[PDB]
Amino acid sequence: KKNGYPLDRNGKTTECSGVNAIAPHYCNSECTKVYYAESGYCCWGACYCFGLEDDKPIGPMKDITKKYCDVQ
């Protein structure tokens, strides 16, 4: 398993801003219901999931981004 920003059919991450950035429910629902991950939340403007299947495409990210998204 892995963590990351899952990509949709068009290769785009799921955007999240405003309340959907402060409250994790929107991204947690996308992560679990659409991507079958364990959980998720909004990290720096896009839905970040925990426990995605290894084969699920995730968006490119710097090592500092993964560390930041993982530590919260």
Residue numbers in the entry: 1 to 72
Sentences from the paper on this structure:
β-Scorpion toxins are polypeptides of 60–76 residues stabilized by four disulfide bridges. They bind with nanomolar affinity to an extracellular receptor (site 4) of voltage-gated sodium channels. β-Toxins induce a hyperpolarizing shift of the voltage-dependence of activation via a voltage-sensor trapping mechanism, whereby toxin-mediated interactions stabilize a persistently-activated conformation of the channel domain II voltage sensor. The extensively-characterized Bj-xtrIT from Hottentotta judaica is a member of the ‘excitatory’ (inducing a spastic paralysis) anti-insect β-toxins and its structure was the first of this class to be solved by X-ray crystallography. The toxins display variability in length, sequence, folds and molecular targets but share a common structural property in that in each case a network of disulfide bridges stabilizes their respective fold. This extensive reticulation establishes the tertiary structure that presents the bioactive surface as well as conferring significant thermostability and resistance to proteolysis.
In this study we show that the Bj-xtrIT β-scorpion toxin can be expressed in its natively-folded conformation by secretion of the polypeptide into the oxidizing environment of the E. coli periplasm. Instead, periplasmic co-secretion of the four bacterial chaperone proteins DsbC, DsbA, SurA and FkpA encoded by the pTUM4 plasmid enabled robust toxin over-expression. To produce natively-folded scorpion toxin directly from a bacterial expression system, we sub-cloned the Bj-xtrIT-(His6) gene into the pASK-IBA expression vector, thereby introducing an OmpA secretion signal at the toxin N-terminus. Purified Bj-xtrIT-(His6) toxin at a concentration of 10 mg/ml was mixed 1:1 (v/v) with 0.2 M NaCl, 0.1 M Bis-Tris; pH 5.5, 29% PEG 3350. Crystals of Bj-xtrIT-(His6) diffracted to 1.7 Å resolution and were solved by molecular replacement using the previously-reported Bj-xtrIT structure. Recombinant Bj-xtrIT-(His6) has both the βαββα-fold and C1–C4, C2–C6, C3–C7, and C5–C8 disulfide connectivity of the native fold. An all-atom structural superimposition of Bj-xtrIT-(His6) with the untagged Bj-xtrIT structure shows that there is a root-mean-square deviation (RMSD) of 0.45 Å. The structures differ only in side-chain rotamers for some residues located on the surface of the toxin, reflecting the difference in crystal contacts that the toxin forms under different crystal packing conditions (space groups C2221 vs I4122). Nevertheless the backbone atoms and disulfide groups all superimpose and show that recombinant Bj-xtrIT-(His6) was expressed with the native conformation. Localized denaturation of the α-helical regions could account for the temperature-dependent changes observed by SRCD signal, but overall the protein displayed significant thermostability that is consistent with a correctly-reticulated toxin structure.
